[PDB]
């Protein structure tokens, strides 16, 4: 596989009481494969992506059993070489575009660095190709907006600008940490169709992280659901939202605006994600799950594989109608 993750764990804080921000996650991404990542804000989706990139600093630490990209091992290969590898073949959209961009260069330089580095063009080609990219991304005025500083862009322009330079990278694998968040629908559709065009044309892989389900229901092949630091569900895109196996995905889909009348109070799953000081033993969803048995309290469920090819980290997977 182009990406493989046997196990991965990132801790924050000192060793006596660590915050387990990512906890023994495992997934794989095939070349030309689109993988959605979904689930509660705080569940480790950005940290899981940053740890593959190798972008975790002092106050945190990376544990993995094996972590591979393109046939090389990111723990056995040295820093000097593993940074070259991941940076050359992987690209990332970051969550906040305003602080991700350098406050002291023009957008044209910002993009024309990546085009120079990853495709080697002359000065006139680099200009034209940033115009083309910002155009295709949907920029109001490419010719004039190259000379604009990242503080003179507004949020949803700065987001398109960094999607633009990330596409310039020509990645083998792009991690899209919310590529649609500050974009209007009429343009959201242009972004997603562009990315899926890439994904088809260039055999490009794509890890797409979203809080909104309909985009990944249409776009994704495979979906990973993360809750409280660990993968709670996995399977085919289409299947998942039609027939949820884990009580968390059922309680995630039942909250959407499509299931209430205008100005009714929306449904939700009560309580809060586990901390470092109140983390319960066994299944982490225990405090919130409505189907919690004593086995859920006593033993952490394995990542159980069903006969339909899917996986759910649950002692009693839900049937096709809504019950264990």
């Amino acid at each position: 596989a182009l990406l493989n993750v046997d196990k991965l764990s990132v801790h924050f804080g000192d060793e006596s009481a660590p915050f387990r921000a990512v906890d023994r996650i495992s997934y794989s991404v095939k070349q030309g494969e689109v993988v959605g990542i979904v689930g509660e804000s705080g569940s480790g989706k950005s940290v899981s992506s940053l740890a593959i990139m190798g972008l975790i600093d002092y106050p945190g630490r990376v544990m993995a059993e094996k972590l591979e990209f393109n046939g090389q091992d990111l723990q056995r290969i040295s820093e000097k070489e593993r940074r070259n590898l991941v940076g050359a073949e992987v690209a990332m959209i970051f969550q906040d575009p305003m602080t991700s961009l350098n406050p002291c260069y023009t957008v044209g330089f910002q993009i024309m660095e990546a085009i120079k580095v990853h495709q080697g063009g002359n000065k006139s080609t680099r200009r034209q190709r940033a115009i083309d990219l910002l155009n295709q991304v949907g920029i109001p005025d490419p010719a004039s907006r190259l000379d604009v500083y990242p503080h003179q862009l507004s949020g949803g322009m700065s987001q398109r600008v960094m999607i633009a330079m990330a596409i310039a990278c020509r990645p083998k694998l792009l991690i899209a940490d919310q590529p649609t968040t500050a974009l209007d629908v009429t343009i959201q559709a242009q972004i997603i169709e562009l990315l899926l065009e890439l994904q088809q044309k260039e055999n490009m892989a794509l890890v797409l992280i979203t809080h909104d389900l309909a985009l990944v229901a249409e776009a994704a092949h495979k979906i990973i659901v993360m809750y409280a630091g660990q993968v709670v569900e996995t399977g085919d895109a289409h299947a998942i939202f039609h027939a949820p196996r884990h009580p968390y995905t059922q309680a995630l889909l039942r909250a959407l605006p499509e299931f209430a009348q205008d100005k009714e109070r929306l449904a939700s799953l009560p309580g809060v994600v586990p901390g470092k000081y109140d983390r319960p033993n066994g299944c982490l969803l225990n405090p919130r799950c409505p189907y919690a048995t004593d086995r859920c309290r006593a033993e952490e469920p394995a990542l159980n594989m069903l006969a339909d090819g899917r996986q759910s980290k649950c002692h009693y997977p839900l049937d096709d109608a809504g019950r264990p």
Partner: peptide, 12 residues
Amino acid sequence: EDYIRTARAKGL
């Protein structure tokens, strides 16, 4: 700062 972390990610 974050924009230096972006500069690592671009492969510079």
